C-alpha cells in the first residue's frame, strides 16, 4: 500500500494578555504518532504511538525546539491576519496548517503538501509542482507576493522532498507491522417493521479498522441509493469503527434485498441478507 506523513497544526487565539494556544499533531499512515500542545504543564513533543519510544532524548529536544519556533511563527502570522482582514480585537480566530508527504507502495515520493487556513477557510497552498502558490482570498495574494520574493517554496520543497521522506522511511520501518493492522467488519441486518406494510432493513458493520468502509443495498442486482439512509462512520472508542446503512422495503420481501460490505481487511466483500 501507499504511505503518508502529516503534521496538522493549529493556533487559536484568545482576547487578552495571553498568547494563542498552539497544537501540533503528527500522523504516519493516518495515525497520530506525536503531539505537541502549548497548554500542557510542560510543553513538549510526546509519543502517541509505542514505536516512537525508540526515539532518543535528542530527537524529542530537537522537535520541541522546532515546535516553539512554529508557536512564535503562528502568533506573528495571527497578528498579520488580523490586519489583512480588518478584524478588530476580541474575536476568536484560528489559523491552521497541514504539511506532509505522500509515498507510493514503492516508498517513493508521490506528492508534497503545504496548506494554510484562516477561520477554517482555505488561505494559501503550495502547488503540487512545489514552486508556486494558489492564494484564495485577496488578503492571501499579499502573502503570496511576499512569499515569492522570499523564496518560501524553495524552502518547503527542500523539506518536503528531503526530510519528510527520509524521516517517514524511518518511522515506516519502526512502526512496521503496527501501522498495517486491519480489523475486518462484522455485519448483521436488523429488521424494523414499520407502518404501511413495510420494514426498515438496517445493515451494521462493527469493529473494523481502518475507518474506510462502504455499505450498499441491492435490489435485484442494482445498487439502491433511493431512500437509503446511513450514518457517518464513528469510532467505538476501542480503536475500531462502526457504520450502518438502511433501506425501507416491503415486509415479507426481505430476501429480495441484499447488503454488501466493502472493506480492505476482507478477503472479499461481505454479502448478507436479513436472517430470521
Amino acid at each position: 500500500g501507499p504511505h503518508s506523513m502529516r503534521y496538522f497544526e493549529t493556533a487559536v487565539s484568545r482576547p487578552g494578555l495571553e498568547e494563542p494556544r498552539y497544537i501540533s499533531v503528527g500522523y504516519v499512515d493516518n495515525k497520530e504518532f506525536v503531539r505537541f500542545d502549548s497548554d500542557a504543564e510542560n510543553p513538549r513533543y510526546e509519543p502517541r504511538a509505542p514505536w516512537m519510544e525508540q526515539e532518543g532524548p535528542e530527537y524529542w529536544e530537537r522537535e520541541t525546539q522546532k515546535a516553539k519556533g512554529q508557536e512564535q511563527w503562528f502568533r506573528v502570522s495571527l497578528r498579520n491576519l488580523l490586519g489583512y482582514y480588518n478584524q478588530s480585537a476580541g474575536g476568536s480566530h484560528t489559523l491552521q496548517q497541514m504539511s506532509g508527504c505522500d509515498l507510493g507502495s514503492d516508498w517513493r515520493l508521490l506528492r508534497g503538501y503545504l496548506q494554510f487556513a484562516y477561520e477554517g477557510r482555505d488561505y494559501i497552498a503550495l502547488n503540487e509542482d512545489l514552486k508556486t502558490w494558489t492564494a484564495a482570498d485577496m488578503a492571501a495574494q499579499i502573502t503570496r507576493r511576499k512569499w515569492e520574493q522570499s523564496g518560501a517554496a524553495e524552502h518547503y520543497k527542500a523539506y518536503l522532498e528531503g526530510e519528510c521522506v527520509e524521516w517517514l522511511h524511518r518511522y515506516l520501518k519502526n512502526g512496521n507491522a503496527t501501522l498495517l493492522r486491519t480489523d475486518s467488519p462484522k455485519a448483521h441486518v436488523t429488521h424494523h417493521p414499520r407502518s404501511k406494510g413495510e420494514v426498515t432493513l438496517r445493515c451494521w458493520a462493527l469493529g473494523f479498522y481502518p475507518a474506510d468502509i462502504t455499505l450498499t443495498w441491492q435490489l435485484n442486482g442494482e445498487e439502491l441509493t433511493q431512500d437509503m439512509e446511513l450514518v457517518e462512520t464513528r469510532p467505538a472508542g476501542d480503536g475500531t469503527f462502526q457504520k450502518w446503512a438502511s433501506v425501507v422495503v416491503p415486509l415479507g420481501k426481505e430476501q429480495n434485498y441484499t447488503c454488501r460490505v466493502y472493506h480492505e481487511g476482507l478477503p472479499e466483500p461481505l454479502t448478507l441478507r436479513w436472517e430470521p
Binding site: 503534521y7 513533543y45 522546532k66 491576519l81 512569499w147 518560501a152 523539506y159
Partner: peptide
C-alpha cells in the same frame, strides 16, 4: 519530523 516555517510569515 515536523515543519519549520522559518522567516516567511503570513
Amino acid at each position: 519530523c515536523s515543519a519549520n516555517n522559518s522567516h516567511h510569515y503570513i
